[PDB]
Amino acid sequence: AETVSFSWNKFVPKQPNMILQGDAIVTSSGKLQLNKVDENGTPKPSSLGRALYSTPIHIWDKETGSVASFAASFNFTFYAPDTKRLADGLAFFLAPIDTKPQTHAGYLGLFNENEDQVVAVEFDTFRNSWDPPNPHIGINVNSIRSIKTTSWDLANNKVAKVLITYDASTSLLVASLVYPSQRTSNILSDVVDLKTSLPEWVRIGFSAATGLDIPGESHDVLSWSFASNLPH
Amino acid sequence: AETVSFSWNKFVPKQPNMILQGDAIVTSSGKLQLNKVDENGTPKPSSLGRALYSTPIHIWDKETGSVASFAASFNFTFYAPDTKRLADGLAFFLAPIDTKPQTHAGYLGLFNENEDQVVAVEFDTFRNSWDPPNPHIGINVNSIRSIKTTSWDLANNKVAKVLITYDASTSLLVASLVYPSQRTSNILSDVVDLKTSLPEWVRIGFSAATGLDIPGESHDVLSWSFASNLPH
Amino acid sequence: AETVSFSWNKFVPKQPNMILQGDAIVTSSGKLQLNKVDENGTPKPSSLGRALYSTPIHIWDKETGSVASFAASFNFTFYAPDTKRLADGLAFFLAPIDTKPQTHAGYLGLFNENEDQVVAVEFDTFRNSWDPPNPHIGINVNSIRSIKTTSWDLANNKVAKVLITYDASTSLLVASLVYPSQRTSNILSDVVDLKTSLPEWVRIGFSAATGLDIPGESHDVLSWSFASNLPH
Amino acid sequence: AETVSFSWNKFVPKQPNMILQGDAIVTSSGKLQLNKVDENGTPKPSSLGRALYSTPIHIWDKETGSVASFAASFNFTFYAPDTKRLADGLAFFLAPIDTKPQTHAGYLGLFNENEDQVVAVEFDTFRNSWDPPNPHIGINVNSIRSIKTTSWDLANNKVAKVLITYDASTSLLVASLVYPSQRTSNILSDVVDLKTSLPEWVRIGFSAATGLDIPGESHDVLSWSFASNLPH
Numbered sequence: 001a002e003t004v005s006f007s008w009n010k011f012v013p014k015q016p017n018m019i020l021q022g023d024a025i026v027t028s029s030g031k032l033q034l035n036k037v038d039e040n041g042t043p044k045p046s047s048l049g050r051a052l053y054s055t056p057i058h059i060w061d062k063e064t065g066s067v068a069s070f071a072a073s074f075n076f077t078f079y080a081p082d083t084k085r086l087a088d089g090l091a092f093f094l095a096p097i098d099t100k101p102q103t104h105a106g107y108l109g110l111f112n113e114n115e116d117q118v119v120a121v122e123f124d125t126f127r128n129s130w131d132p133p134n135p136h137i138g139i140n141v142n143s144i145r146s147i148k149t150t151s152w153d154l155a156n157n158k159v160a161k162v163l164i165t166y167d168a169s170t171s172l173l174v175a176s177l178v179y180p181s182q183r184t185s186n187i188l189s190d191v192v193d194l195k196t197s198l199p200e201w202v203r204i205g206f207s208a209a210t211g212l213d214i215p216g217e218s219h220d221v222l223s224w225s226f227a228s229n230l231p232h
Numbered sequence: 233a234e235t236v237s238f239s240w241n242k243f244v245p246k247q248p249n250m251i252l253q254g255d256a257i258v259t260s261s262g263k264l265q266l267n268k269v270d271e272n273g274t275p276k277p278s279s280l281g282r283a284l285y286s287t288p289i290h291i292w293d294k295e296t297g298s299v300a301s302f303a304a305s306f307n308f309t310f311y312a313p314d315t316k317r318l319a320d321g322l323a324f325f326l327a328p329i330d331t332k333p334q335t336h337a338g339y340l341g342l343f344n345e346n347e348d349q350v351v352a353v354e355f356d357t358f359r360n361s362w363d364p365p366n367p368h369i370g371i372n373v374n375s376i377r378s379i380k381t382t383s384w385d386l387a388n389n390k391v392a393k394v395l396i397t398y399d400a401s402t403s404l405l406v407a408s409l410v411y412p413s414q415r416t417s418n419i420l421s422d423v424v425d426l427k428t429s430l431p432e433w434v435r436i437g438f439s440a441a442t443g444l445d446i447p448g449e450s451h452d453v454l455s456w457s458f459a460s461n462l463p464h
Numbered sequence: 465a466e467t468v469s470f471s472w473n474k475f476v477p478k479q480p481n482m483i484l485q486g487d488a489i490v491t492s493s494g495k496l497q498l499n500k501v502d503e504n505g506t507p508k509p510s511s512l513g514r515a516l517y518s519t520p521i522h523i524w525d526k527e528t529g530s531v532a533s534f535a536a537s538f539n540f541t542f543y544a545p546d547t548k549r550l551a552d553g554l555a556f557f558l559a560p561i562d563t564k565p566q567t568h569a570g571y572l573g574l575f576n577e578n579e580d581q582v583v584a585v586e587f588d589t590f591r592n593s594w595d596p597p598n599p600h601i602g603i604n605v606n607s608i609r610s611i612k613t614t615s616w617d618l619a620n621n622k623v624a625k626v627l628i629t630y631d632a633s634t635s636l637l638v639a640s641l642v643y644p645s646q647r648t649s650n651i652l653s654d655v656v657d658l659k660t661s662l663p664e665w666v667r668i669g670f671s672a673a674t675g676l677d678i679p680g681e682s683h684d685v686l687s688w689s690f691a692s693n694l695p696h
Numbered sequence: 697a698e699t700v701s702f703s704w705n706k707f708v709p710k711q712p713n714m715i716l717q718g719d720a721i722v723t724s725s726g727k728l729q730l731n732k733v734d735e736n737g738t739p740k741p742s743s744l745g746r747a748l749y750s751t752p753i754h755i756w757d758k759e760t761g762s763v764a765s766f767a768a769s770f771n772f773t774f775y776a777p778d779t780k781r782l783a784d785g786l787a788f789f790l791a792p793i794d795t796k797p798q799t800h801a802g803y804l805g806l807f808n809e810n811e812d813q814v815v816a817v818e819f820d821t822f823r824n825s826w827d828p829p830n831p832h833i834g835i836n837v838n839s840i841r842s843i844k845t846t847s848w849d850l851a852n853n854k855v856a857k858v859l860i861t862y863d864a865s866t867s868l869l870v871a872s873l874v875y876p877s878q879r880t881s882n883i884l885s886d887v888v889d890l891k892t893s894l895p896e897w898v899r900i901g902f903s904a905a906t907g908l909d910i911p912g913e914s915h916d917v918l919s920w921s922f923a924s925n926l927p928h
């Protein structure tokens with residue numbers, strides 16, 4: 001085996017175990033603030049933040065052909081000056097180490113218009129042409145066109161708690177989101193082949209975009225947990 | 233703190249850390265077989281099995297007024313000779329140590345017709361008068377009338393994987409069930425106050441009933457995991 | 465695999481997950497008090513206490529021939545009215561489920577004069593004919609005659625912290641005792657074959673005796689931790 | 697809290713979560729080989745290897761004034777062409793992120809002749825003027841002059857297993873080394889104040905040197921484990 005794992009109940013400004021890209025930063029108040037905001041705290045359009053964890057993860061193994069199993073979780077929120085007009089979303093993902101930001105807005109900073117090898121779970125607020133009705137949750141295997149999605153019952157300014165799981169044995173990825181304040185929950189599950197989708201080593205992180213021409217909503221990540229196993 | 237936790241990938245016949253009630257037994261093949269069956273393997277009506285874990289759990293504390301947080305999981309299946317005619321269901325629960333079986337069939341062995349202090353998560357196959365349309369999943373706080381339920385997309389003879397969580401801090405209980413074979417999943421969540429619902433010490437286990445006049449479906453528990461924390 | 469594990473930072477009077485034998489009891493003040501004492505708090509001679517954990521442990525497996533690996537720890541102390549005159553000792557051990565107390569004093573309640581299948585780590589204060597000079601630590605495989613022992617640098621009324629390990633793979637048992645207050649430590653290690661020494665299922669606990677004709681020292685167990693794994 | 701932790705049962709050549717300094721490298725055969733050797737496999741004098749783990753560790757906190765507790769372990773060996781002539785040693789340590797190698801041989805690559813803020817546990821084979829008789833184990837707080845040491849019963853070409861612990865609460869560091877093949881073990885313990893000794897963030901790793909004018913012994917690290925907690 002080969003294992004790793006970490007937990008933070010807060011973000012520490014300037015923490016060396018993290019890598020901030022784009023607009024992303026950490027507040028004195030221990031928030032991971034992915035997008036840029038007004039003094040009033042209002043979001044700025046055409047914004048983009050990413051955040052990754054420094055140590056790369058050994059997700060699969062060529063010789064052995066072994067596949068890691070992982071799990072992650074994190075508390076997060078959003079702020080929408082106007083809830084009738086949201087965009088663009090937030091995502092948790094896995095990418096090559098070298099990873100850098102891609103297209104914004106609708107592409108959630110993870111994908112570029114044409115065809116990085118990315119695996120992602122999206123929390124989408126905005127109906128692109130490829131999107132389904134309503135904000136939803138989706139699995140993204142090398143495309144902004146989710147292989148599966150599900151209605152997401154978002155709640156502005158309220159804390160959502162998230163759970164992600166990868167069962168190597170079934171090759172089945174599961175995502176669940178719960179809002180304790182509203183006693184509400186959504187889940188989603190599908191199969192993903194790590195191997196054909198990613199490099200043996202990856203980096204994980206968060207991505208988030210605001211509306212192109214609109215402010216839509218900010219995206220703050222409050223806490224974060226991760227564990228992984230890779231067997232013999 | 234005070235913690236406990238256990239995991240089994242199989243059941244061992246005659247294992248001393250378990251307590252079998254009613255029809256319940258463990259197969260040579262490491263299954264926990266809750267209800268009785270034909271040679272052909274068909275279920276016998278009016279059957280009832282319970283199974284508990286020996287060590288009692290310290291779920292809450294009077295002096296401190298502290299509340300445990302727990303989580304559990306287990307792989308399970310069902311066998312329905314005839315899928316048009318199912319009953320009665322399966323449940324995971326928490327009860328007083330002294331606990332013994334109650335009414336069968338529709339009462340899932342946990343509750344008696346009139347008004348034990350029981351907390352349960354049910355997997356219900358049968359529309360009682362108190363039930364909602366379709367097999368579902370529900371939270372049972374001292375009553376067979378779920379405070380909340382959700383459509384359960386059962387699949388006969390297929391393995392379902394289950395997850396239960398209790399967040400003391402939010403007092404929010406979450407139940408998720410996933411069927412990897414069908415890439416299908418359901419979740420459900422609501423608040424439950426341990427304190428007002430149960431004794432400081434409890435025992436946990438499984439309950440399962442067959443149709444009164446029908447065979448409906450058997451209920452086998454394949455594996456089992458549990459962890460709990462009780463703080464200062 | 466098959467795993468279990470538990471931790472207590474205090475003892476709860478009347479806790480159902482424990483079994484008290486002999487003089488042993490739990491104080492309002494959360495101590496596990498193995499031997500009997502004066503109002504003044506002085507120990508009573510010819511005293512004997514044992515304490516076990518309720519759930520039995522699956523230490524080895526016949527079919528598979530698999531062996532568990534475990535580890536334990538606990539904070540403990542002793543009280544000697546007169547340090548020139550100590551007896552008799554304290555022990556942590558593994559026994560058959562059925563286990564009941566044996567001979568006292570020098571036999572630490574675990575062994576009887578002539579030849580239960582017991583494995584124990586002793587903290588011996590008293591030179592029996594079979595003992596070596598000075599209080600020591602020893603490994604006891606079915607005999608009060610340690611297969612190995614080591615000088616123990618005891619310190620009255622001071623808290624000692626203990627560590628026990630069993631590496632199934634090497635079949636090597638290790639015991640370390642440290643006294644933080646005095647920046648002092650002892651270790652001891654040797655091989656033990658679980659299989660030939662014990663039953664597939666065992667119960668673990670503590671034993672402790674006072675001097676036959678003397679008071680010697682009391683033995684209180686403050687905290688306790690245990691984890692075990694048994695593989696496929 | 698804030699936690700991290702990792703385990704490897706082998707080293708992967710070119711693994712990105714590690715940083716190799718000096719002569720240090722990883723063998724096809726998954727060894728971490730700290731010093732340089734002959735084709736015959738014999739060690740080369742005046743050699744030096746270091747190895748660190750990439751992610752930095754948050755060992756203590758200014759605001760809170762909280763101190764982490766950690767533990768580590770690793771399997772290691774040594775090869776001495778001639779056991780009458782050994783040098784120079786191996787060490788596990790904590791340093792500033794920026795850390796780079798210091799003086800070799802007797803200084804184990806961690807310290808320079810005159811007075812980096814380093815905390816280390818040494819496995820010393822060579823009697824310097826500051827050393828005590830015999831190979832030993834020692835605690836090094838900002839000096840190659842151990843604040844405490846203990847006889848180390850080394851065994852050439854044999855696998856030693858090591859354990860390191862830091863109890864923030866007692867501020868007591870413990871080191872134990874065991875050689876299963878020989879049923880032999882050594883322990884050592886003393887207090888160390890993280891705060892006054894190191895920066896809030898540190899990097900951990902291994903260091904190892906060969907004899908100045910002699911080959912002495914090689915130093916290979918086989919496996920490695922680490923966990924840390926930093927509280928609120």
Ligand SMILES: [Ca+2]
Nearest residue numbers: 124126128131
């Ligand atoms: Ca979209």
Ligand SMILES: [Ca+2]
Nearest residue numbers: 356358360363
């Ligand atoms: Ca029903």
Ligand SMILES: [Ca+2]
Nearest residue numbers: 588590592595
């Ligand atoms: Ca004795």
Ligand SMILES: [Ca+2]
Nearest residue numbers: 820822824827
């Ligand atoms: Ca030296």
Ligand SMILES: [Mn+2]
Nearest residue numbers: 122124131138
């Ligand atoms: Mn979408």
Ligand SMILES: [Mn+2]
Nearest residue numbers: 354356363370
């Ligand atoms: Mn129902």
Ligand SMILES: [Mn+2]
Nearest residue numbers: 586588595602
């Ligand atoms: Mn003895």
Ligand SMILES: [Mn+2]
Nearest residue numbers: 818820827834
């Ligand atoms: Mn030295």
